[PDB]
Amino acid sequence: ETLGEKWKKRLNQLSRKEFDLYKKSGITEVDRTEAKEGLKRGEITHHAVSRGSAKLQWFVERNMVIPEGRVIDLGCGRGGWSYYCAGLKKVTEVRGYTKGGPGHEEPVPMSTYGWNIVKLMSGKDVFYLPPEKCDTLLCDIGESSPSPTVEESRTIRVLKMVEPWLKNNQFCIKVLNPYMPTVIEHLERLQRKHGGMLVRNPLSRNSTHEMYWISNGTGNIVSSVNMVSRLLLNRFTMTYRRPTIEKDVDLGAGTRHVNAEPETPNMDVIGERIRRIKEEHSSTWHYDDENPYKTWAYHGSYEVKATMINGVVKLLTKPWDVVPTVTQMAMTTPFGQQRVFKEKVDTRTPKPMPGTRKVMEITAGWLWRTLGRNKRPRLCTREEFTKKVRTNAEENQWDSARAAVEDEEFWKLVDRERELHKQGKCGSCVYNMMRAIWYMWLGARYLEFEALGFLNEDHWFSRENSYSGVEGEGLHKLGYILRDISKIPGGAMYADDTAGWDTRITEDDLHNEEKITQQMDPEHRQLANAIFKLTYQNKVVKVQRPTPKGTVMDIISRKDQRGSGQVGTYGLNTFTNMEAQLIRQMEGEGVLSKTDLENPHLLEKKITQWLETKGVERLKRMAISGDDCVVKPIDDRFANALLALNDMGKVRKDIPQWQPSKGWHDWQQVPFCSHHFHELIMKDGRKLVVPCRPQDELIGRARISQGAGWSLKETACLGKAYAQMWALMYFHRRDLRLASNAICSAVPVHWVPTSRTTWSIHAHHQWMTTEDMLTVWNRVWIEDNPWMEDKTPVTTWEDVPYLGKREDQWCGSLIGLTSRATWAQNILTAIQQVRSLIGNEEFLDYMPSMKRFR
RNA sequence: AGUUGUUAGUCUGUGUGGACCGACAAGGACAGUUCCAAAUCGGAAGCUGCUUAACACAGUUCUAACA
Numbered sequence: 001e002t003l004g005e006k007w008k009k010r011l012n013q014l015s016r017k018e019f020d021l022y023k024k025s026g027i028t029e030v031d032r033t034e035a036k037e038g039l040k041r042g043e044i045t046h047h048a049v050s051r052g053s054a055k056l057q058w059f060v061e062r063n064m065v066i067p068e069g070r071v072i073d074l075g076c077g078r079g080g081w082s083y084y085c086a087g088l089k090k091v092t093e094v095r096g097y098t099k100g101g102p103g104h105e106e107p108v109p110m111s112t113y114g115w116n117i118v119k120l121m122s123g124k125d126v127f128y129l130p131p132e133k134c135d136t137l138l139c140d141i142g143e144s145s146p147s148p149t150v151e152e153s154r155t156i157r158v159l160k161m162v163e164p165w166l167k168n169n170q171f172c173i174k175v176l177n178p179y180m181p182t183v184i185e186h187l188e189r190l191q192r193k194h195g196g197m198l199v200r201n202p203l204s205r206n207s208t209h210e211m212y213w214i215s216n217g218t219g220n221i222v223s224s225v226n227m228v229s230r231l232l233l234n235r236f237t238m239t240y241r242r243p244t245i246e247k248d249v250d251l252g253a254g255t256r257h258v259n260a261e262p263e264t265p266n267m268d269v270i271g272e273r274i275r276r277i278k279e280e281h282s283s284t285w286h287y288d289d290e291n292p293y294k295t296w297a298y299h300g301s302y303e304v305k306a307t308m309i310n311g312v313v314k315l316l317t318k319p320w321d322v323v324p325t326v327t328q329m330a331m332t333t334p335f336g337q338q339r340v341f342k343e344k345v346d347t348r349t350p351k352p353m354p355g356t357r358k359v360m361e362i363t364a365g366w367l368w369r370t371l372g373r374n375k376r377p378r379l380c381t382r383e384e385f386t387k388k389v390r391t392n393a394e395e396n397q398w399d400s401a402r403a404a405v406e407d408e409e410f411w412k413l414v415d416r417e418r419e420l421h422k423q424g425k426c427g428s429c430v431y432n433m434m435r436a437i438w439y440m441w442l443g444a445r446y447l448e449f450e451a452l453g454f455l456n457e458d459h460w461f462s463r464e465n466s467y468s469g470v471e472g473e474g475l476h477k478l479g480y481i482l483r484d485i486s487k488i489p490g491g492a493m494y495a496d497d498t499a500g501w502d503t504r505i506t507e508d509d510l511h512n513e514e515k516i517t518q519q520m521d522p523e524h525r526q527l528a529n530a531i532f533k534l535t536y537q538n539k540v541v542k543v544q545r546p547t548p549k550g551t552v553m554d555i556i557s558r559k560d561q562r563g564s565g566q567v568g569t570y571g572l573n574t575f576t577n578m579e580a581q582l583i584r585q586m587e588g589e590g591v592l593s594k595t596d597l598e599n600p601h602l603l604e605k606k607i608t609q610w611l612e613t614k615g616v617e618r619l620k621r622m623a624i625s626g627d628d629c630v631v632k633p634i635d636d637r638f639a640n641a642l643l644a645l646n647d648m649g650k651v652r653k654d655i656p657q658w659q660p661s662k663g664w665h666d667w668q669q670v671p672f673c674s675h676h677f678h679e680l681i682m683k684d685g686r687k688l689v690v691p692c693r694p695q696d697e698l699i700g701r702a703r704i705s706q707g708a709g710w711s712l713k714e715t716a717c718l719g720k721a722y723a724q725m726w727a728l729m730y731f732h733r734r735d736l737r738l739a740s741n742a743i744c745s746a747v748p749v750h751w752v753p754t755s756r757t758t759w760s761i762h763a764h765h766q767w768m769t770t771e772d773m774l775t776v777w778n779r780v781w782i783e784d785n786p787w788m789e790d791k792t793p794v795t796t797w798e799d800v801p802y803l804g805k806r807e808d809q810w811c812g813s814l815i816g817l818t819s820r821a822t823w824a825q826n827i828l829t830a831i832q833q834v835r836s837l838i839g840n841e842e843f844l845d846y847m848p849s850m851k852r853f854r
Numbered sequence: 855a856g857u858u859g860u861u862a863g864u865c866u867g868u869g870u871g872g873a874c875c876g877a878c879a880a881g882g883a884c885a886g887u888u889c890c891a892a893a894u895c896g897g898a899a900g901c902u903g904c905u906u907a908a909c910a911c912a913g914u915u916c917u918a919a920c921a
């Protein structure tokens with residue numbers, strides 16, 4: 001009696017809930033709720049048809065099977081495997097076959113990336129098929145039954161049918177029941193004939209002993225079968241473990257043209273960088289050929305080594321241990337990194353139409369002329385960069401940066417590279433996507449700062465100067481900016497997000513952002529042109545990648561797709577967004593039609609006049625920051641001006657490509673910088689405007705102390721910083737104010753907060769002091785607030801207003817539940833516990849600041 | 855394998871429709887006197903001293919078990 005059948009019988013002797021829980025013990029699962037909803041609604045993009053997509057992705061990622069050439073899918077069913085395989089590099093045609101009909105699944109015609117090369121046929125049983133020549137053969141046929149002999153016979157039938165297909169080609173066949181002696185003998189004969197191994201997918205439910213026979217990979221069948229069987233047996237009596245969760249597979253959209261995907265790099269521009277990278281790592285450099293990069297270039301790879309809850313906060317915010325999102329925030333590996341790269345960065349946006357490029361050029365020229373009506377560009381200096389680094393104004397490894405700045409050979413390296421830039425070549429300007437390496441990277445950043453740092457150090461995109469940007473405001477002013485927008489006559493307030501803004505920057509966008517050089521001086525212009533044309537339009541990137549033989553860093557390159565970690569990313573993103581929404585408003589007002597977009601030479605007098613007359617006005621109906629936009633057009637035709645927006649390649653997120661945009665009317669609901677804004681009324685009758693966000697996110701981000709040092713002296717100070725931020729910006733949430741008072745009461749008063757709380761450009765970090773928080777609140781919201789005419793100070797933490805209970809609950813509070821009530825009443829005990837744990841330092845009771853404990 | 859459904863009760867929304875209103879407050883929540891609401895009284899309507907409906911349609915209301 002083999003082990004497998006023993007497992008089968010033991011399983012067959014289970015009960016209802018015992019079965020329901022044992023089938024999900026220690027397996028990984030895919031959150032299909034979003035996909036289920038989307039498919040139910042009727043979307044045609046960005047969605048896996050079933051869970052077959054992730055199941056095959058697990059194989060494809062680890063190079064167990066490498067789909068290539070023509071892919072034949074047998075038993076495609078809904079089409080998960082076929083649609084996933086349509087979006088790989090070497091694949092060129094996918095044919096899926098299935099029985100279909102009553103009691104069977106049918107293909108779901110969709111338009112994910114690569115749909116134009118996929119043909120799915122129904123009403124064809126594969127068993128009576130005249131097998132053809134296939135370069136990849138995927139088979140996912142099988143029907144599980146309690147009877148083991150029936151499954152055995154079914155398995156033999158499947159293997160017999162599938163054998164005449166395998167003619168030295170990549171394959172992945174599903175074997176439902178591999179623990180039977182004749183099944184095993186047949187598998188061994190097949191392996192001897194064709195090679196390949198037998199492996200278990202970890203996404204497969206626990207109820208089944210299914211495995212997959214795959215081409216790339218060798219091993220012993222019986223040993224692996226026994227290994228899986230023993231795993232099932234030990235999971236039988238193993239304590240229930242909740243199933244690990246994995247994010248669903250994204251699949252892009254649009255037709256795929258394989259003949260236009262590969263990129264031809266300007267080797268004479270990046271050759272020096274590539275050569276230096278090769279020389280530094282010459283022991284392991286090797287042109288791997290299994291590279292999955294479709295739209296980027298590939299140049300090589302080298303081996304490399306592959307590379308916590310805050311105690312105090314978690315000890316004081318217990319009731320949220322059960323909220324799902326709070327934990328889910330806490331949960332960068334090369335597998336996840338590669339998935340992110342494959343489904344987000346590795347696309348190719350179609351070229352704009354002939355008229356659209358002309359429109360974009362005209363708009364960019366006018367916009368750069370208008371932005372520079374007062375200020376003039378200037379070179380930054382070494383001392384400015386030094387000061388900015390020293391003040392520590394997206395990581396924590398700043399001390400090494402400061403040491404590099406204060407060193408001297410570093411500046412010699414920078415000078416050498418700068419002379420190279422003046423010549424017209426770039427040697428060591430290459431950036432990652434995760435100490436000589438440190439100095440080269442920091443020097444590249446410094447040169448970019450020197451050339452394009454005036455876009456921040458002179459506030460080129462402040463609200464006063466740019467008419468749209470919100471640089472230099474901070475959170476406590478975006479609300480008033482939105483309110484002042486809403487008073488302007490017009491339609492709704494559309495905040496249409498864009499999917500992966502960085503990765504949708506056409507070449508023309510860079511060519512237009514380059515126009516700022518037309519206003520500098522030649523000594524500056526040489527350096528700026530060097531930056532633009534040698535490290536923005538020809539970028540060389542390193543990226544990790546896992547392979548059966550460890551982790552290798554790939555070196556790739558591309559010409560579009562502004563890298564997210566460059567100086568001047570914010571400024572140029574804001575500029576592109578401003579001109580994009582300007583064009584969208586242009587179309588919305590009828591000046592720009594389809595015919596105008598299509599003709600190669602649209603007359604520019606019309607656009608010139610429209611801009612010169614109304615551009616400044618239409619620029620005041622917006623609030624822009626990076627990819628975040630809010631726009632209030634004159635009439636609601638704006639919601640249907642999607643030709644210009646989609647043609648430029650800026651496709652909106654989570655909405656079909658042509659469904660008109662949905663705009664709000666209550667400005668207190670329009671999202672902006674991941675916040676919305678509430679208008680409070682104090683007892684004095686003078687109104688405040690405050691930020692707000694689903695407080696699960698706030699608590700989560702408070703419980704994810706990230707490299708702040710394990711030192712209790714440091715985690716406590718980080719918690720204090722978070723609490724003071726809560727008291728200063730989110731004082732109007734009952735849970736947040738209560739928890740903030742608790743934390744600030746359970747940390748010694750003399751300790752100084754460190755380890756900055758947020759990375760957003762919209763935080764001036766007023767909470768990072770040691771002062772009477774009431775005074776800082778007064779300074780932030782009363783004295784230094786341009787929108788508060790009556791400067792009468794607030795004297796105690798009781799005149800400070802609160803959100804209405806309805807809105808407070810609606811934004812994710814926990815008032816009205818029993819656990820929160822008990823926590824609120826017992827908060828003194830938890831404070832005492834933290835005080836005892838800390839030591840014997842001074843503690844001020846901030847709880848009496850509420851009328852609860854007074 | 856992928857897919858994954860019924861049954862009964864309960865919370866929304868709407869309509870039909872006489873189909874509700876006010877005062878009040880036990881108690882709870884909240885910590886900004888800020889909100890819930892039993893029980894009671896008063897009125898309103900219906901069928902004669904008693905009642906505050908019932909049904910319909912839809913849910914990612916919740917519950918509870920069955921394929």
Ligand SMILES: *OP(=O)(O)OP(=O)(O)OC[C@H]1O[C@@H](n2cnc3c(=O)[nH]c(N)nc32)[C@H](O)[C@@H]1O
Pocket residue numbers: 011012013014015016019023144145146147205206207208
């Ligand atoms: O993961 P999946 O293959 O979808 O599980 P299935 O529900 O399809 O069942 C497969 C396999 O599991 C056994 N089984 C199903 N339902 C069961 C039950 O209620 N109680 C027991 N003890 N076993 C059960 C069945 O053998 C079937 O072949």
Ligand SMILES: [Mg+2]
Pocket residue numbers: 144855
């Ligand atoms: Mg099943």
Ligand SMILES: [Zn+2]
Pocket residue numbers: 417421425426427428429535
């Ligand atoms: Zn360089």
Ligand SMILES: [Zn+2]
Pocket residue numbers: 676678692693694807811
């Ligand atoms: Zn809110």
